């Protein structure tokens, strides 16, 4: 997998919507609770993501949020290639809701439980103690010099 | 250190912008919030720390940074509490592309985009976005 490729998936919990962006090559994630899966919120999410990483391609679930012209215009402004219906990360959702379960009682609000879960996902040593965490792998893959 | 950040408040069009600058690179993140609260600050710092390896944050000395919710976030994340060069710069950029968007929010994240991806200097230059990942990739050795 190439360095510029992300998967976007929504997940739902307690009646709220979590947008998740998974860096394919590394397994790094970031995520936010938004009110609902609208064009505006998706567009805003993508734009934040693309301001921080060098995002070339997005694979989406082709939900109606991604087919809106708001998102299309966000992706064109950022020069992101949007690839609707293209699969690959579904485990990513079951994993994330799992970690959210483990921290949920340390937060007043779900949204804080989601970020704590992101943090924990991104810092976990994958494959023993000789390994690298998702946050380490992304910076390794993306680094140009 | 790969791990030192400065966090700053900025006010325009009546809303508040929270700006984090990675000191060694000039890389920024920013979130637009209704008010400068302990809740939003903590939340912002938690997003920040889930993404980058944040060790120390330098802050103005507002009460938003000293609530117990911020200290619990900073204790949980292992963060220690303690240039305007990339702050006047953010303001400048928001104003050059502001017309391109209705909501302040959206121009803020456009301006963060533009700032993080702008190559500094000629051929041989780097963007702030590249400097941060290079600095941290180097440090992971």
């Amino acid at each position: 997998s190439s360095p510029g490729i992300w998967q976007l998936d929504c997940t739902h919990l307690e009646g709220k919507v979590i947008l998740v962006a998974v860096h394919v090559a590394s397994g790094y994630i970031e995520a936010e609770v938004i009110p609902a899966e609208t064009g505006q919120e998706t567009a805003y999410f993508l734009l934040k993501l693309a301001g921080r990483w060098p995002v070339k391609t997005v694979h989406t679930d082709n939900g109606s949020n991604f087919t809106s012209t708001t998102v299309k215009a966000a992706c064109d402004w950022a020069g992101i290639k949007q690839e609707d219906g293209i699969p690959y990360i579904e485990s990513m959702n079951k994993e994330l809701k799992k970690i959210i379960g483990q921290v949920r009682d340390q937060a007043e609000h779900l949204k804080t439980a989601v970020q704590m879960a992101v943090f924990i996902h991104n810092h976990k040593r994958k494959g023993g103690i000789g390994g690298y965490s998702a946050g380490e792998r992304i910076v390794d893959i993306i680094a140009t010099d | 250190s790969p791990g030192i950040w400065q966090l700053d408040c900025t006010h325009l069009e009546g809303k508040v912008i929270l700006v984090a600058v990675h000191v060694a690179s000039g890389y920024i993140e920013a979130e637009v919030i209704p008010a400068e609260t302990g809740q939003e600050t903590a939340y912002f710092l938690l997003k920040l720390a889930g993404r980058w390896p944040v060790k120390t944050v330098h802050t103005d000395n507002g009460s938003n940074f000293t609530s117990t919710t911020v200290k619990a976030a900073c204790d949980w994340a292992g963060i220690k509490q303690e240039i305007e060069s990339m702050n006047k710069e953010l303001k400048k950029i928001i104003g050059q592309v502001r017309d391109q968007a209705e909501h302040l929010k959206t121009a803020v994240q456009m301006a963060v985009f533009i700032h993080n991806h702008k190559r500094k200097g000629g051929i041989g230059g780097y963007s702030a976005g590249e400097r941060i990942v290079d600095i941290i990739a180097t440090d992971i050795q």
Binding site: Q40, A43, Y44, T69, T70, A73, W77 | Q100, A101, E102, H103, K105, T106, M110
Partner: peptide, 6 residues
């Protein structure tokens, strides 16, 4: 456009 067309 950029958040609400044009």
């Amino acid at each position: 456009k950029x958040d609400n067309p044009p």
